[PDB]
Amino acid sequence: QPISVTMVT
Amino acid sequence: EKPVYLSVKADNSMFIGNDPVTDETMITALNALTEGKKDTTIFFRADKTVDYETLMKVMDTLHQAGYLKIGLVG
Amino acid sequence: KPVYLSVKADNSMFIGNDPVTDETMITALNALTEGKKDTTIFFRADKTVDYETLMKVMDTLHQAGYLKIGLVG
Q1: Class of domain B4-72 as given by CATH
Q2: Dihedral sign computed on CA atoms, order B17, B20, B26, B30
């Protein structure tokens, strides 16, 4: 179930 | 693979770049930009009031289609 | 061991079962991880938690070097 995410800014 | 920007509005309307999409049309619209390249980076942006249920529905549609390179933009 | 960060609909926050705020979250997390920044963090939230709140939490982790994030639905 997990969705790996990067945060970008 | 130019990255794709998926935007969710406060009224839960959704866009791939400038293209309005729904849950039922998102992957077809995305595949036109990516040419099926699942390694294309997808950047998610949303209005502050968009809720986690909505975010995760979008995330799951991408995930099940094999789009796994996701960046959240704040 | 992975760490579960929970956000409730009133925006109260937990690391495991431990209540945290923005100002105390990294100290609480470091007690669990012993500073291992490669520790997996799973984020869970009630359905009505908003994107602003999510990204505030994400940014606090990010600036502290916690970059292994999984969103749980």
Answers
A1: alpha beta
A2: negative
